[PDB]
Enzyme design. Structure first.
Site, PDB file in Angstrom:
ATOM      1  N   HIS A  61       0.810  -1.086  -0.064  1.00 43.74           N
ATOM      2  CA  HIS A  61       0.104  -0.247   0.064  1.00 43.74           C
ATOM      3  C   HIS A  61       0.924   1.225  -0.043  1.00 43.74           C
ATOM      4  O   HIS A  61       0.366   2.345  -0.340  1.00 43.74           O
ATOM      5  CB  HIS A  61      -0.970  -0.167   1.140  1.00 43.74           C
ATOM      6  N   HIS A  91       5.558   6.933   6.512  1.00 41.77           N
ATOM      7  CA  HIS A  91       5.324   6.467   5.242  1.00 41.77           C
ATOM      8  C   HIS A  91       4.813   7.923   4.666  1.00 41.77           C
ATOM      9  O   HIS A  91       4.609   8.791   4.924  1.00 41.77           O
ATOM     10  CB  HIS A  91       4.391   5.574   5.409  1.00 41.77           C
ATOM     11  N   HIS A  93       1.843   9.305   1.208  1.00 40.33           N
ATOM     12  CA  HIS A  93       0.567   9.203  -0.024  1.00 40.33           C
ATOM     13  C   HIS A  93       1.257   9.723  -0.968  1.00 40.33           C
ATOM     14  O   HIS A  93       1.497  11.120  -0.784  1.00 40.33           O
ATOM     15  CB  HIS A  93      -0.552   9.203   0.891  1.00 40.33           C
ATOM     16  N   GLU A 103      -3.558  13.421   1.098  1.00 34.51           N
ATOM     17  CA  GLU A 103      -4.705  13.250   1.902  1.00 34.51           C
ATOM     18  C   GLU A 103      -5.523  14.271   2.370  1.00 34.51           C
ATOM     19  O   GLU A 103      -6.595  14.560   2.099  1.00 34.51           O
ATOM     20  CB  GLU A 103      -4.411  11.956   2.873  1.00 34.51           C
ATOM     21  N   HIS A 116       3.558  11.063   6.665  1.00 33.04           N
ATOM     22  CA  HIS A 116       2.916  10.595   7.920  1.00 33.04           C
ATOM     23  C   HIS A 116       3.906  10.101   8.770  1.00 33.04           C
ATOM     24  O   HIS A 116       4.290   8.982   8.526  1.00 33.04           O
ATOM     25  CB  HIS A 116       1.792   9.781   7.753  1.00 33.04           C
ATOM     26  N   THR A 195      -6.120   6.493   8.073  1.00 35.35           N
ATOM     27  CA  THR A 195      -6.726   6.658   6.893  1.00 35.35           C
ATOM     28  C   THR A 195      -6.571   5.597   5.974  1.00 35.35           C
ATOM     29  O   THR A 195      -6.931   5.561   4.963  1.00 35.35           O
ATOM     30  CB  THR A 195      -5.701   7.880   6.081  1.00 35.35           C
ATOM     31  N   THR A 196      -5.948   4.423   6.630  1.00 31.68           N
ATOM     32  CA  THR A 196      -6.365   3.061   5.978  1.00 31.68           C
ATOM     33  C   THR A 196      -6.944   2.199   6.614  1.00 31.68           C
ATOM     34  O   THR A 196      -6.776   2.389   7.845  1.00 31.68           O
ATOM     35  CB  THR A 196      -4.549   2.271   5.398  1.00 31.68           C
TER      36      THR A 196
HETATM   37  C1  LIG Z   1      -4.755  -6.605   8.807  1.00 34.07           C
HETATM   38  C2  LIG Z   1      -4.613  -5.539   9.664  1.00 34.07           C
HETATM   39  C3  LIG Z   1      -5.005  -5.650  11.029  1.00 34.07           C
HETATM   40  C4  LIG Z   1      -5.051  -4.569  11.817  1.00 34.07           C
HETATM   41  C5  LIG Z   1      -4.247  -3.433  11.661  1.00 34.07           C
HETATM   42  C6  LIG Z   1      -3.914  -2.219  12.139  1.00 34.07           C
HETATM   43  C7  LIG Z   1      -4.602  -2.249  13.951  1.00 34.07           C
HETATM   44  C8  LIG Z   1      -3.332  -1.674  11.578  1.00 34.07           C
HETATM   45  C9  LIG Z   1      -2.705  -0.277  11.829  1.00 34.07           C
HETATM   46  O1  LIG Z   1      -2.871   0.336  12.866  1.00 34.07           O
HETATM   47  N1  LIG Z   1      -1.844   0.116  10.737  1.00 34.07           N
HETATM   48  C10 LIG Z   1      -1.106   1.227  11.105  1.00 34.07           C
HETATM   49  C11 LIG Z   1      -1.454   2.811  10.432  1.00 34.07           C
HETATM   50  C12 LIG Z   1      -0.675   3.713  10.738  1.00 34.07           C
HETATM   51  C13 LIG Z   1      -0.796   5.047  10.207  1.00 34.07           C
HETATM   52  C14 LIG Z   1      -1.804   5.298   9.313  1.00 34.07           C
HETATM   53  S1  LIG Z   1      -1.942   6.891   8.673  1.00 34.07           S
HETATM   54  N2  LIG Z   1      -2.255   6.886   7.118  1.00 34.07           N
HETATM   55  O2  LIG Z   1      -0.866   7.648   9.169  1.00 34.07           O
HETATM   56  O3  LIG Z   1      -3.438   7.208   9.112  1.00 34.07           O
HETATM   57  C15 LIG Z   1      -2.619   4.102   9.049  1.00 34.07           C
HETATM   58  C16 LIG Z   1      -2.364   2.798   9.526  1.00 34.07           C
HETATM   59  O4  LIG Z   1      -3.132  -2.127  10.216  1.00 34.07           O
HETATM   60  C17 LIG Z   1      -3.784  -3.194  10.439  1.00 34.07           C
HETATM   61  C18 LIG Z   1      -3.704  -4.254   9.425  1.00 34.07           C
HETATM   62  C19 LIG Z   1      -3.135  -3.919   8.117  1.00 34.07           C
HETATM   63 ZN   LIG Z   2      -0.789   7.742   5.932  1.00 26.77          ZN
END
Ligand SMILES: Cc1ccc2c(C)c(C(=O)NCc3ccc(S(N)(=O)=O)cc3)oc2c1C
Ligand SMILES: [Zn+2]
Length: 257
Positions: A61, A91, A93, A103, A116, A195-196
């Site tokens: 992603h 990371h 976007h 975003e 981010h 945001t994911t």
């Molecule tokens: C399958 C699965 C199950 C649980 C989780 C969790 C709990 C996360 C997670 O917390 N990912 C970290 C994350 C950090 C920062 C951002 S952002 N773009 O900065 O808002 C978005 C996502 O991913 C998961 C996955 C891929």
């Molecule tokens: Zn992000």
């Protein structure tokens, strides 16, 4: 599984993750005229002097630059935050073209990309517990525009050839994230979400007003990454951004007049 395409992109995410239609989703458009200056907001404290990067990963992603978060080495404090938030990863976007990729938007303006820097609240002990709390994470968002090169980004750009495809990682030690920060720490802040997927409503967003400039060549290298794994049909990793979501009952606060 979810992604960024016609049949699995942001408009589909709510089926597997109903919180997608929740009350504090991110990103949002930042209406600069309606954001209120809050003189009670403190300067942001970004203490990255002891940051220990370990690795860079293509997760299918985006790519994550990961940090050793087993001690108080890189922390975010102050600003709108209570207590101490530890850096775990950063990371980006980005878009297929320079006119999209961010975003958050600013008065509907889309930037070429958005960085981010993800931090978790140390009162919850680790990241998995923190994401279950409404004040669990603090994400520092920084816009990227295309112009002059960002010298501190080049080490990231040059390792991307080695993590072209989903599931590839590379050692990435001694990277200093201070080299990715603009001059000013003026910011907007609001309560939001990842945001994911899983889109958890656990984030205090801190979005810097001042973008960093990166070169066209730097962002072009982001766009050579692949969403697919090795030995699969090439799908360029571009347009890995979620559009702005409804603000609903939230206020965006500005740290600056
Ligand atoms: C399958 C699965 C199950 C649980 C989780 C969790 C709990 C996360 C997670 O917390 N990912 C970290 C994350 C950090 C920062 C951002 S952002 N773009 O900065 O808002 C978005 C996502 O991913 C998961 C996955 C891929
Ligand atoms: Zn992000």
């Amino acid at each position: 599984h979810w992604g960024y395409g016609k049949h699995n992109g942001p408009e589909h995410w709510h089926k597997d993750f109903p919180i997608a239609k929740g009350e504090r989703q991110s990103p949002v458009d930042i209406d600069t005229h309606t954001a209120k200056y809050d003189p009670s907001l403190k300067p942001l404290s970004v203490s990255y002097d002891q940051a220990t990067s370990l690795r860079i990963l293509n997760n299918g992603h985006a790519f994550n630059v990961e940090f050793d978060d087993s001690q108080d080495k890189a922390v975010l404090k102050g600003g709108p935050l209570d207590g101490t938030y530890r850096l775990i990863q950063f990371h980006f976007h980005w878009g297929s073209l320079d006119g999209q990729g961010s975003e958050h938007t600013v008065d509907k303006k889309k930037y070429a990309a958005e960085l981010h820097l993800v931090h978790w609240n140390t009162k919850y002990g680790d990241f998995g517990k923190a994401v279950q709390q409404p004040d669990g994470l603090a994400v520092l968002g920084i816009f990227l525009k295309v112009g002059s090169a960002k010298p501190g980004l080049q080490k990231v750009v040059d390792v991307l050839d080695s993590i072209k495809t989903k599931g590839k990682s590379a050692d990435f030690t001694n990277f200093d994230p201070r080299g990715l920060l603009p001059e000013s720490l003026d910011y907007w802040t609001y309560p939001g979400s990842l945001t994911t997927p899983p889109l958890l409503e656990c984030v205090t967003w801190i979005v810097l007003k001042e973008p960093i400039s990166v070169s066209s060549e730097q962002v072009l290298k982001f766009r050579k990454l692949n969403f697919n794994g090795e030995g699969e049909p090439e799908e360029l990793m571009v347009d890995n951004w979620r559009p702005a979501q409804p603000l609903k009952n939230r206020q965006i606060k500005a740290s600056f007049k």
